[PDB]
Amino acid sequence: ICVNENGGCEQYCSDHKRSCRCHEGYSLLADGVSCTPTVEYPCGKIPILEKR
Amino acid sequence: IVGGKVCPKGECPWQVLLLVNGAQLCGGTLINTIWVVSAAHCFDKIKNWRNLIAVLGEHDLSEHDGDEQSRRVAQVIIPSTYVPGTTNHDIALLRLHQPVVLTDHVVPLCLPERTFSERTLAFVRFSLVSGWGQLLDRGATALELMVLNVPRLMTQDCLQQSRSPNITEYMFCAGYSDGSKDSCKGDSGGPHATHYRGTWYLTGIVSWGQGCATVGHFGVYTRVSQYIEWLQKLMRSEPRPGVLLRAPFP
Numbered sequence A: 001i002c003v004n005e006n007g008g009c010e011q012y013c014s015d016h017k018r019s020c021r022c023h024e025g026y027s028l029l030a031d032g033v034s035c036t037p038t039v040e041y042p043c044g045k046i047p048i049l050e051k052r
Numbered sequence B: 001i002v003g004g005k006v007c008p009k010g011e012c013p014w015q016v017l018l019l020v021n022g023a024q025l026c027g028g029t030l031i032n033t034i035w036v037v038s039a040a041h042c043f044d045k046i047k048n049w050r051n052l053i054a055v056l057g058e059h060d061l062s063e064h065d066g067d068e069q070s071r072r073v074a075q076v077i078i079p080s081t082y083v084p085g086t087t088n089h090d091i092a093l094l095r096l097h098q099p100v101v102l103t104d105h106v107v108p109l110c111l112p113e114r115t116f117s118e119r120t121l122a123f124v125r126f127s128l129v130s131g132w133g134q135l136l137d138r139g140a141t142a143l144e145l146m147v148l149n150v151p152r153l154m155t156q157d158c159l160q161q162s163r164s165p166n167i168t169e170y171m172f173c174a175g176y177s178d179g180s181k182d183s184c185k186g187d188s189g190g191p192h193a194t195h196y197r198g199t200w201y202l203t204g205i206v207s208w209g210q211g212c213a214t215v216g217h218f219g220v221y222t223r224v225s226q227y228i229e230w231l232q233k234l235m236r237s238e239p240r241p242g243v244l245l246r247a248p249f250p
């Protein structure tokens, strides 16, 4: 599943059945695919643009 | 960077400036609060290993605005397979003496998992390259941080579309053969950063090229995906006395 469209995952994907995972500083949402920041400065996000 | 634009201040917050005795040496990429990824070749001519400095939150080299954070480079880790004065395995992992503080102006780029990078990120066409390198081949370096959108090529396509070193599995091409847009030697070590679903990831390091923005040539970048496990293992390791460390690859 993971090799096609990232297995639907926003970030990381493991074949097992399919499990999506998120980088440190993020947590996986109940949709099982989306990652949301858990810290103020998660990697790969640009604060001044996140603000707008 | 040739043919790009000023990176608006804070929009390239993972960019690192490396200094040797206060002089510009290379760029790099912050990947968490104490670790920086750069190019091994940046260290080929290091006189005093104890005088290496990494600057985060830098933007305009002519001024201090207070967002800059300077750290000594405590360790430079280079893979066993890299040979000084050559191109293959062009990667260095730098440990800062003290963590930087994350701020709106200082943020790590995500180091992706290998599979995600190979299966997904490798097929995102455009990525950003940045640095305070030459604005023209044989020209002056930039005072403000510059950034450039470049498309990636599969290596067979790169060779087909190009008019000296071999392009290995540890490298990839990105840029333009019309001589309009490229990174340059002063950008060596800096990020090639790839966006995917709202988040940016480290996919390449400014490595080499035939001049810069040379007609019939593309920029060549270290293919970071080959090094994910090597980096992750080292980041879990205890520091060792001495700055330089050669670490087995794979």
Ligand SMILES: COc1cc([C@@H](Nc2ccc(C(=N)N)cc2)C(=O)N[C@H](C(=O)O)c2ccccc2)ccc1OCc1ccccc1
Binding pocket: B041, B042, B043, B044, B045, B085, B086, B087, B090, B164, B165, B182, B183, B184, B185, B186, B187, B188, B206, B207, B208, B209, B210, B211, B212, B213, B218, B219, B220
């Ligand atoms: C690493 O390697 C290298 C590097 C170089 C550069 N870089 C670059 C360029 C370009 C680019 C683009 N275009 N993008 C990027 C980057 C650089 O960096 N340069 C510098 C000097 O010269 O001094 C150096 C080198 C080596 C070591 C150290 C240092 C240069 C060169 C080289 O190699 C050799 C060769 C290549 C090609 C052709 C010929 C030769």
Ligand SMILES: [Ca+2]
Binding pocket: B058, B059, B060, B061, B062, B063, B064, B065, B068
């Ligand atoms: Ca400044």
